[PDB]
Amino acid sequence: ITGGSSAVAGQWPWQVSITYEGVHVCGGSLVSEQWVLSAAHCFPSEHHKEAYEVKLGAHQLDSYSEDAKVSTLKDIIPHPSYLQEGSQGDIALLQLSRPITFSRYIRPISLPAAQASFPNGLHCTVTGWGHVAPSVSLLTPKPLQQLEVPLISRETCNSLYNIDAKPEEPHFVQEDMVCAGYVEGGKDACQGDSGGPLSCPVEGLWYLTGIVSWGDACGARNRPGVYTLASSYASWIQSKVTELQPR
Ligand SMILES: NCCCC[C@H](NC(=O)OCc1ccccc1)C(=O)N[C@@H](CCc1ccccc1)C(=O)N[C@@H](CCCCN)[C@H](O)c1nc2ccccc2o1
């Protein structure tokens, strides 16, 4: 996250860190005791399931905490429509090896229904431990960063992405995607934020509106972050989780 601030411990208790071979690669959002939602693109086919971990209840990734818990994965379920980068369906259900116990620092975020609308301009928050500037990693001890971002329609977003575009480097915001951020840049999600929450306030609660997906250069003007809409997958998530792990 570039241009944000450090959250306070426990503020975003659904935020998880996903690591591959012990290195943070992506965020995720806890959605039940044994399920995490992240980005499909965080889980390429060449990676081995056994090398992933999920760290929950963390604030400073580098700091010891008796509140943080680390898990392996039993299942990685990318949405079947995700074919390649920029594809629709950049979303994955992750089943933890075992169920965790909710705590003050580990709590799920509510999923929106399929027809949840989050209107343009809504001030949502994206969080993560990804880069704080182009190719600049968050400094140890890696306190979770947060950034308030207003929602930007895919239509506006597409037109912004066209400004000074390289015709070879296309960027198309699809119907399952939304943007959020600022036309002048300097404030966005960045590399290593992928997979994490865009959390939006609705009726006193917080919903997982978006999953950090892609953009252009960290904090580039005319390039607000692109997110997969969780609402687009609410039916699929409910179906998958209900069949695989009925309550
Ligand atoms: N390197 C600086 C420049 C980065 C720009 C790049 N854009 C791009 O390729 O457009 C292609 C396109 C073509 C056609 C239609 C649309 C899009 C980009 O966003 N790539 C994603 C990962 C790949 C990806 C690309 C398209 C879709 C889905 C996934 C990335 O970096 N996502 C970050 C979060 C970024 C948050 C908003 N800026 C997450 O944290 C993470 N995923 C990563 C995977 C590997 C390594 C680092 C990663 O970081």
Describe this structure in words.
- With 247 residues, the protein is mainly beta.
- It folds into two domains: 1-12 and 109-231, Beta Barrel (Thrombin, subunit H); 13-108 and 232-247, Trypsin-like serine proteases (Thrombin, subunit H).
- The chain is built from two helices and 14 strands.
- The strands form two sheets. Strands 6-5-2-3-4-8-7 form a seven-stranded antiparallel sheet, with no helix packed on it. Strands 9-10-11-14-13-12 form a six-stranded antiparallel beta barrel.
- The ligand NCCCC[C@H](NC(=O)OCc1ccccc1)C(=O)N[C@@H](CCc1ccccc1)C(=O)N[C@@H](CCCCN)[C@H](O)c1nc2ccccc2o1 is lined by residues 41, 85-86, 90, 130, 170-172, 188-194, 212-218, 225.
- Belongs to the peptidase S1 family.
- Disulfide bonds join 26-42, 124-200, 157-179, 190-218.
- Keywords: Cell membrane, Disulfide bond, Glycoprotein, Hydrolase, Membrane, Protease, Secreted, Serine protease, Signal, Transmembrane, Transmembrane helix, Zymogen.
- Its EC number is 3.4.21.-.
Task: Give the secondary structure arrangement, pairings included.
Elements: E1 5-6, E2 15-20, E3 23-30, E4 35-38, E5 52-56, E6 69-71, E7 73-78, E8 92-96, E9 123-128, E10 145-152, H1 154-161, E11 177-180, E12 197-202, E13 205-214, E14 225-229, H2 234-244
Antiparallel strand pairs: 1-10, 2-3, 2-5, 3-4, 4-8, 5-6, 7-8, 9-10, 9-12, 10-11, 11-14, 12-13, 13-14
The chain binds ligand B4C.
Function: Possesses a trypsin-like cleavage specificity with a preference for poly-basic substrates. Stimulates epithelial sodium channel (ENaC) activity through activating cleavage of the gamma subunits (SCNN1G).
EC number: 3.4.21.-
Subunit structure: Heterodimer of two chains, light and heavy, held by a disulfide bond.
